[PDB]
Design a protein around this ligand. Sequence first.
Ligand SMILES: Nc1nc2c(ncn2[C@@H]2O[C@H](COP(=O)(O)OP(=O)(O)NP(=O)(O)O)[C@@H](O)[C@H]2O)c(=O)[nH]1
Ligand SMILES: Cc1cc2nc(N)n(Cc3ccc(F)c(Cl)c3)c2cc1C
Ligand SMILES: [Mg+2]
Lengths: 166, 167, 467
Amino acid sequence: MTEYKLVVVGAGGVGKSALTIQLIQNHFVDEYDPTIEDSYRKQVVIDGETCLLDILDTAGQEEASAMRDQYMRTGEGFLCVFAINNTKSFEDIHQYREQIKRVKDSDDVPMVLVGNKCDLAARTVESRQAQDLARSYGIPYIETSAKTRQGVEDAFYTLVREIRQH
Amino acid sequence: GMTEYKLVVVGAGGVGKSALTIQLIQNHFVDEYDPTIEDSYRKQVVIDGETCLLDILDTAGQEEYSAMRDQYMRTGEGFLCVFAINNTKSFEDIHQYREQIKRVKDSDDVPMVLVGNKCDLAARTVESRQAQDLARSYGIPYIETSAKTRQGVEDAFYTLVREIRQH
Amino acid sequence: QMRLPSADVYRFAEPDSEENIIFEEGIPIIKAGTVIKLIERLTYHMYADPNFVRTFLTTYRSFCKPQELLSLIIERFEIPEPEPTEADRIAIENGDQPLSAELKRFRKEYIQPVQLRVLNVCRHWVEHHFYDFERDAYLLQRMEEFIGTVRGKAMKKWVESITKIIQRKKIANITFQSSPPTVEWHISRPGHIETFDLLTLHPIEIARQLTLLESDLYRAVQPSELVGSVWTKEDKEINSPNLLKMIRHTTNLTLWFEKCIVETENLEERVAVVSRIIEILQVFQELNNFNGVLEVVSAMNSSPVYRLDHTFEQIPSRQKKILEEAHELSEDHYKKYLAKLRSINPPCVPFFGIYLTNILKTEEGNPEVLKRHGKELINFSKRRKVAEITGEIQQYQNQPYCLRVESDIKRFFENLNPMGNSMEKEFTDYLFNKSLEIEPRNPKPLPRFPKKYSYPLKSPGVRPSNP
Ligand SMILES: Nc1nc2c(ncn2[C@@H]2O[C@H](COP(=O)(O)OP(=O)(O)NP(=O)(O)O)[C@@H](O)[C@H]2O)c(=O)[nH]1
Ligand SMILES: Cc1cc2nc(N)n(Cc3ccc(F)c(Cl)c3)c2cc1C
Ligand SMILES: [Mg+2]
């Protein structure tokens, strides 16, 4: 079985940890406990092949912004997460994208753009706007809910497929 | 190829039983071990001039899975019955292990050796004469081993292979 | 490169040497080190390694007491700031604001990452290794105090968070979201617990409810029950109660299968019993319940059962093959089991026995310390090997089964007690004697026995139904 190093990045509070824990444990975390850095593993069959996913769950709080280079070096693929009810988190995406490209010195890094909290009606970022950005990056856009599981496997396993074809 | 012998180690848990096979298979001059890799329990040896392959099953740690003992024992042609010389209960356990081996193999004459293992510096409570008498009553060899110095370890396994060859 | 505080005022700034740290041959892997060096690298300023944090927090008690660990990471946290540099000094002397470039860099690249990583150790400690605090209330008071008195806005969000997490842990729901299959019933109907038995419950539902039970038992075992080989020692009932409950369930089910078989004296009925057990095995295989698979295989390889040639002869060839495939998982030191476990799609229930043997042998077969250049270094690669096993265990504990609990069937299997009040040797001898009675040793001829079951023996099979 192949091992894949996935990294989940994005602004504080957008639901990076809730997405990860929903994937790992099938459980929704209601609490907002800011992450410093957490690691998870998951054996899973994707497209008929057994994979071992190593998932690095990172800090979104700005106070941790000086510590990103280190995990970006190890990651093979990145989930870039914003919340569809938070415009600022969407604006923060481009900074993560650029830093990842910078660190890995590559224009061709596996990534998926994720618009989280799609269970909430009060949307402020339109799908089209996020889709346009994703196309400009050459990556898929998947809307998710860590609360209902909508799109969660699709976002993570799509990232696996991109690493696999890299 | 060469003859391969399927050896099975049995005995009470929690009293250093695992040191016997570890010390054998090991190094045999750098104290370290990874039980995770095959060849951590397979070993090519020369005994009385004849080269052979030892496959040792030691399920140390699984003693509470008591209903699996028959299944593990069934795989073996020769048995080391191990007690700790500072643990009288483990010595008293030997009779039932021997009875259980006889039953699984459906035979009164299964190749086996009795091994008294010294696993620490705590006071001995089973005298070697006690263990010799028991082994004699069974018609099997008795070997004492140290869990620290590797003393007696080759003797225990080689003696069992001889019991198999002379069965 | 950043200058560090003097090693005299701050112990974690000692230069690396082979007298205090040894690396394995994109971050370094530590083979051995002093506790000070291990803690420095646990909280290193250059990189994070959350897996190192798990390994360390799982295994440290073999070389450091919990009270001492807390003192050491508090010491690590308390980093002195450098004095102003010559350029700063000159600025200040002229009444200007110093650039303080070196100070700002040291804060940003050394102090804040190290302090955040100390806090991450505290967070992981509390969230995933809380038993230290359950067993030592003073340790918890010290942690609460330390966290509750960290000042400064940089750490504030995490300090306030960890304070809340601790308070929650002191006083202390699944989405799938396809629904679980419908519960299946055979001769015994819902609520009629008095009639529940091997042949009257549906074999599909027997396997499902045992899988839920065995999954829960598997998922309840903590690393604290495993490190230090404590399940093998005198205080095992104190230190490893969940592990032992799990193993005793497995043992009881195996003995129940043997008992059901040898107490069915009539050959035709006994064949139906064995055949039903192999059907349950098939559903265990489908559910990836490898504990359940081996429960059955252990029963069929047991002395009382294995010798029943007349029974084996009448088992359908397709079921012989199933049993054979299951048994072959265990051959050659579980070679095929290990490959299958690593290939399936969870949820599953691993066989725990292999993990136990590998943990015990890793601990027994490697030294606590390495002696180098006159110094004793903690052998950390030994602890990493143990933590790789506990990590694999935890990885299979995450995924829940999408199966509905049936409270009565669950209770029936929770309360199974095939030995009754008998001791093990007594019961075990009884089973073998029963075996000898129902199928005597050659050349004694085979007796006939009366039937004991009044209900149909025909199985409903193990393909699920769906109205
Ligand atoms: N309704 C809804 N709430 C969500 C969703 N995902 C996360 N949340 C909530 O949003 C909050 C933040 O979640 P969290 O996973 O901690 O975010 P984070 O991105 O990991 N934060 P940090 O960067 O600081 O670690 C929590 O209260 C969580 O329950 C979602 O899909 N829907
Ligand atoms: C792989 C395997 C092969 C076996 N061959 C025999 N004769 N048994 C014992 C036995 C007794 C009575 C039965 F009804 C059956 Cl099915 C099986 C075997 C058990 C196992 C696990
Ligand atoms: Mg988070």
